[PDB]
Design a binder for this molecule. Sequence first.
Ligand SMILES: *[C@@H]1O[C@H](CO)[C@@H](O[C@@H]2O[C@H](CO)[C@@H](O)[C@H](O)[C@H]2NC(C)=O)[C@H](O)[C@H]1NC(C)=O
Ligand SMILES: *[C@@H]1O[C@H](CO)[C@@H](O[C@@H]2O[C@H](CO)[C@@H](O)[C@H](O)[C@H]2NC(C)=O)[C@H](O)[C@H]1NC(C)=O
Ligand SMILES: *[C@@H]1O[C@H](CO)[C@@H](O)[C@H](O)[C@H]1NC(C)=O
Lengths: 50, 57
Amino acid sequence: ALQIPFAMQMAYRFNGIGVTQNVLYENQKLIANQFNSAIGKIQDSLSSTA
Amino acid sequence: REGVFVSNGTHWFVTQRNFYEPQIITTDNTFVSGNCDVVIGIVNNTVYDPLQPELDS
Ligand SMILES: *[C@@H]1O[C@H](CO)[C@@H](O[C@@H]2O[C@H](CO)[C@@H](O)[C@H](O)[C@H]2NC(C)=O)[C@H](O)[C@H]1NC(C)=O
Ligand SMILES: *[C@@H]1O[C@H](CO)[C@@H](O[C@@H]2O[C@H](CO)[C@@H](O)[C@H](O)[C@H]2NC(C)=O)[C@H](O)[C@H]1NC(C)=O
Ligand SMILES: *[C@@H]1O[C@H](CO)[C@@H](O)[C@H](O)[C@H]1NC(C)=O
């Protein structure tokens, strides 16, 4: 395991889908808010029905 | 453009992701976007420009 800062991991992962790294870094707070919100929606989905 | 920025503690280099091979950071190794306000955790170093040593003529 090689440590890497989590934003820089996402920058590699965006570059892995042909989206240029700066499209992450210029939007990092938006992307974090979307991700954190989406995880919250999984808890609601799982809580709502078995 | 490819690889990642690193420093040994004093000098900044670009290097490829899976094998340490430091290179000077240049206008050829990089691409510009935006400005210094936007990026979280950006840092200050010279970027070298291979045209200017030629235009020193
Ligand atoms: C970081 O890397 C640079 C380049 O390898 C080091 O700077 C060189 O250090 C040697 C030995 O002290 C000198 O002979 C060179 O003239 C230096 N080159 C330049 C461009 O300054 C630097 O010492 C390294 N720093 C650390 C903290 O390891
Ligand atoms: C990178 O360099 C810039 C200047 O080129 C630094 O910006 C100054 O920072 C001080 C302290 O916050 C302010 O008082 C100045 O008004 C800033 N000037 C400008 C033009 O913004 C910046 O702090 C440096 N960053 C790092 C991480 O060293
Ligand atoms: C990085 O972490 C240090 C503490 O380890 C903190 O002081 C600093 O503000 C952080 N910087 C960024 C860009 O996250």
